[PDB]
Write an enzyme that holds these catalytic residues in place. Structure first.
Site, PDB file in Angstrom:
ATOM      1  N   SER A  25      -2.976   2.335   2.185  1.00 39.95           N
ATOM      2  CA  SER A  25      -3.585   2.279   0.853  1.00 39.95           C
ATOM      3  C   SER A  25      -3.347   3.522   0.016  1.00 39.95           C
ATOM      4  O   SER A  25      -3.756   3.519  -1.154  1.00 39.95           O
ATOM      5  CB  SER A  25      -5.084   2.036   0.969  1.00 39.95           C
ATOM      6  OG  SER A  25      -5.296   0.677   1.331  1.00 39.95           O
ATOM      7  N   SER A  81     -10.471   0.839  -1.960  1.00 47.47           N
ATOM      8  CA  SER A  81      -9.275   0.381  -1.241  1.00 47.47           C
ATOM      9  C   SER A  81      -9.143  -1.142  -1.258  1.00 47.47           C
ATOM     10  O   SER A  81      -8.545  -1.740  -0.351  1.00 47.47           O
ATOM     11  CB  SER A  81      -9.266   0.909   0.190  1.00 47.47           C
ATOM     12  OG  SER A  81      -7.978   1.338   0.525  1.00 47.47           O
ATOM     13  N   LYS A 122      -7.418   9.832  -1.602  1.00 45.68           N
ATOM     14  CA  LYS A 122      -7.227   8.422  -1.305  1.00 45.68           C
ATOM     15  C   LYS A 122      -6.744   8.314   0.134  1.00 45.68           C
ATOM     16  O   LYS A 122      -5.767   8.969   0.515  1.00 45.68           O
ATOM     17  CB  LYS A 122      -6.222   7.775  -2.265  1.00 45.68           C
ATOM     18  CG  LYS A 122      -5.900   6.297  -1.928  1.00 45.68           C
ATOM     19  CD  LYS A 122      -6.962   5.384  -2.542  1.00 45.68           C
ATOM     20  CE  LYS A 122      -7.068   4.026  -1.827  1.00 45.68           C
ATOM     21  NZ  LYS A 122      -7.592   4.152  -0.443  1.00 45.68           N
ATOM     22  N   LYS A 130      -1.964   3.133  -3.492  1.00 44.37           N
ATOM     23  CA  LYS A 130      -2.713   2.597  -4.620  1.00 44.37           C
ATOM     24  C   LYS A 130      -2.935   3.638  -5.706  1.00 44.37           C
ATOM     25  O   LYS A 130      -3.160   3.260  -6.856  1.00 44.37           O
ATOM     26  CB  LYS A 130      -4.042   2.008  -4.129  1.00 44.37           C
ATOM     27  CG  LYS A 130      -3.782   0.789  -3.252  1.00 44.37           C
ATOM     28  CD  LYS A 130      -4.982   0.388  -2.410  1.00 44.37           C
ATOM     29  CE  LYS A 130      -4.647  -0.822  -1.573  1.00 44.37           C
ATOM     30  NZ  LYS A 130      -5.828  -1.344  -0.835  1.00 44.37           N
ATOM     31  N   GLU A 136      -0.141  -6.499  -0.238  1.00 45.02           N
ATOM     32  CA  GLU A 136      -1.240  -6.501   0.711  1.00 45.02           C
ATOM     33  C   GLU A 136      -1.359  -7.889   1.326  1.00 45.02           C
ATOM     34  O   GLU A 136      -1.241  -8.888   0.615  1.00 45.02           O
ATOM     35  CB  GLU A 136      -2.566  -6.133   0.037  1.00 45.02           C
ATOM     36  CG  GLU A 136      -2.648  -4.676  -0.404  1.00 45.02           C
ATOM     37  CD  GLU A 136      -2.718  -3.678   0.737  1.00 45.02           C
ATOM     38  OE1 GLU A 136      -2.721  -4.074   1.928  1.00 45.02           O
ATOM     39  OE2 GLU A 136      -2.768  -2.466   0.435  1.00 45.02           O
ATOM     40  N   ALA A 160      -5.386   3.155   6.092  1.00 47.62           N
ATOM     41  CA  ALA A 160      -5.313   2.820   7.498  1.00 47.62           C
ATOM     42  C   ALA A 160      -4.353   1.651   7.654  1.00 47.62           C
ATOM     43  O   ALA A 160      -4.231   0.796   6.769  1.00 47.62           O
ATOM     44  CB  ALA A 160      -6.690   2.474   8.076  1.00 47.62           C
TER      45      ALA A 160
END
Lengths: 263, 164
Positions: free
Chosen positions: A45, A105, A209, A48, A141, A212
């Site tokens: 993440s 996230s 930020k 992002k 994602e 995982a």
């Protein structure tokens, strides 16, 4: 500081997995400390932040509005949607989606934002155009978290991510308003409590930020510093470890403790 | 303890905010900000966050009642047997019972369930997550799952990731 490098190497042997690390001076761009800075790691993440940097660049150029409302549906939802799954009826503004993607996230939020900019390939073109020829997003994602060994899709290098974060937060790429908005979203991060934030002293600034992924992947990018202002960029990635989430969290938090102790 | 699947099943539609906090443990929970007037409670670490539940209410009143239950990684399927072939057999228009008979009675967990007209059942929406034999994970992302969603107890759509 060499004690932090000692800690990074120790985190490596305790996780049984590569750890990538870099400290960048925020204003000069000078590399202060590093370990495996030019090896590739899954972004998870942490991408992002780059995604919302691209969104903000579109806002700067009049191509996007932070207030634009996006209506989406059940077919848009992917795993882990804590904010977006609560607004199926009313939708969410672009601002609200970047907030959810960065501070929570949210995975559906990030996919909806990827759609507005034209996909991972367009984010990669954006990065290419600001001089990052290393970082690449290839998938959406949740597949981008797969972290297959030797797979270069959806990866960055610590040095590349650090330099790109520096250009986004302090360079001329984004307007002042967008620079401030992106930092504000990162400062409002709600999900990285057990990572660098757990070692941070009172009165310090941090905008971060985390990420995982599969195969023990874990990481964080941050702009932090004493005196309530960011003055360094720190980037930490690991992948491949079989250790628990708590143990990976603790190793990153301890690198942060060493980083702050020897500031 | 933290928020758990047991606590999630014990919380019922129509419960007050206090009933929810009493079951969840209020130290696990929060409201406001990104969650509005919903109550959001955290479990064990998972992915980039924590297993969680989110409980939506009819209004912001103190006597407001639960009209929505969402969770991630609190529930696990009891006997996951979904496959791509079974997913292919799921058809829009099927009842919840017809879907469950198709994908396996123990393959699914409730992702989200919302009663927009609570206390009426009119327009009720239900999102299930269903899992193949090794697709569920409590701490990483799924590796073989489907999202099946219903309105008024009738399947409206389906989507899958990594089924074989």
């Amino acid at each position: 500081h060499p004690e932090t490098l000692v800690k990074v190497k120790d985190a490596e042997d305790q996780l049984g997995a590569r750890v990538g690390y870099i400290e960048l001076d925020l204003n000069s761009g000078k590399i202060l400390e590093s370990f495996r800075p030019e090896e590739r790691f899954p972004m998870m993440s942490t991408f992002k932040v780059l995604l919302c940097g691209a969104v903000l660049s579109r806002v700067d150029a009049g191509q996007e509005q932070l207030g634009r409302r996006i209506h989406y549906s059940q077919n848009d939802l992917v795993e882990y949607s804590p904010v977006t799954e609560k607004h199926l009826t009313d939708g969410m503004t672009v601002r609200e989606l970047c907030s959810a993607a960065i501070t929570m996230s949210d995975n559906t939020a990030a996919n909806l934002l990827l759609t507005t900019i034209g996909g991972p390939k367009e984010l990669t073109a954006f990065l290419h155009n600001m001089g990052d020829h290393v970082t690449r997003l290839d998938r959406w994602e949740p597949e981008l978290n797969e972290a297959i060994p030797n797979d270069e899709r959806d990866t960055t290098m610590p040095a590349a991510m650090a330099t790109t974060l520096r250009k986004l937060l302090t360079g001329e790429l984004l307007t002042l308003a967008s620079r401030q908005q992106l930092i504000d979203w990162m400062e409002a991060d709600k999900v990285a409590g057990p990572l660098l934030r757990s070692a941070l002293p009172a009165g310090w600034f941090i905008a971060d930020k985390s990420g995982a992924g599969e195969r023990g992947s874990r990481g964080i990018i941050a702009a932090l510093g004493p005196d309530g202002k960011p003055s360094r960029i720190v980037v930490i990635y690991t992948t491949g470890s079989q250790a628990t989430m708590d143990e990976r969290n603790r190793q990153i938090a301890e690198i942060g403790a060493s980083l702050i102790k020897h500031w | 303890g933290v928020m758990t699947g047991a606590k999630f099943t014990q919380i019922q539609f129509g419960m007050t905010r206090q009933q929810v906090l009493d079951i969840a443990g209020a130290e696990n929970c929060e409201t406001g900000g990104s969650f509005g007037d919903s109550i959001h409670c955290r479990g064990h670490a998972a992915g980039d966050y924590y297993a969680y539940a989110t409980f939506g209410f009819t209004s912001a009143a103190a006597d407001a009642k639960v009209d929505s239950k969402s969770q991630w990684k609190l529930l696990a399927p009891s006997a996951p047997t979904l496959t791509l072939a079974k997913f292919n057999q799921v058809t829009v228009g099927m009842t919840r019972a017809q879907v469950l008979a198709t994908v396996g009675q123990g393959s699914c967990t409730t992702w989200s369930e919302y009663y927009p007209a609570y206390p009426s059942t009119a327009g009720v929406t239900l999102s299930l997550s269903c899992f193949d034999v090794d697709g569920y994970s409590s701490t990483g992302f799924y590796r073989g799952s489907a999202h099946l969603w219903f309105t008024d107890g009738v399947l409206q759509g389906k989507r899958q990731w990594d089924l074989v």
